[PDB]
Symmetry: C3
């Protein structure tokens, strides 16, 4: 009964099952700086929630991976707090981890509620 969105032989961008939406970790576009990269990740999450039948106000959890948490946490929080729908922040966890490409400073993995 799972439904899949934008599937290739490595991943589906989203998997939907019983009112839950599981998004693949989202990475930036071509932005090179932490502020722009966080903005681009959040834009991609915005678009995928739409395709998977959810929306920003229905995020349940987000794991935020930063390549350098000491250097970039403050910038991440600036963009994140401005993006979230007012009064509707999800649960979150922010940790340091290198991502699959060295240029990536931030990656975010979301679970959300359909609706």
């Amino acid at each position: 009964e799972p439904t899949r969105i934008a599937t290739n032989d490595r991943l589906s961008a989203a998997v939907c099952f019983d009112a839950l939406v599981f998004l693949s970790g989202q990475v930036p576009g071509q932005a090179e700086d932490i502020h722009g990269q966080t903005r681009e990740v959040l834009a991609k999450i915005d678009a995928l929630l739409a395709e998977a039948g959810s929306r920003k106000e229905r995020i349940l959890s987000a794991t935020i991976y930063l390549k350098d948490i000491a250097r970039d946490f403050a910038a991440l929080n600036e963009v994140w707090t401005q993006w979230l729908p007012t009064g509707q922040a999800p649960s979150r966890t922010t940790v340091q981890a290198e991502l699959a490409r060295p240029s990536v400073l931030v990656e975010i993995t979301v679970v959300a509620a359909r609706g």
Copy 2:
């Protein structure tokens, strides 16, 4: 239909949806050592499960982040195994990651079942 617990402009400590509870990653209080910090994280999880309508016996998954997994895994396991309700350990994953503040040695992210 999500419900939120202890929300600010960065995160909600918990988000509840369809009998699931999603907790933000929990960090220690003022303890400075791994044993005490793990005890404090688990105390905070205990209290949040209560507010979100769950309990320790209903944990589904826990990601345990250690700043130094080689150094501190044994201590983490001592405190963890003593804290868990008998015979009711959840699924878990323990990995190394630097946390948002350098003093933090351990952070734990829980999903639990309402009830």
Copy 3:
């Protein structure tokens, strides 16, 4: 209402709740190389999905932890893409993290749908 599979005082290999299956992070057997270790992790996930009432075609999410993401991502992807049931890739996130034992190059944490 959770059900547990293969429980000890540290973890349950799986916890089942309301049509969801939460697997503990799975680690390799005795393989020493990234290709073999990834194969062994995926074999273990295969077996646990079976015991927990799911199957590979019903994976919802996978966090893939690599000890060295720059060195080993390509090998991970070779084994992963060949293992997945055709056209049915789950959501995934791949990040770098040291695992609990230094010989472990890869660990994978799965959530799946019962059925």
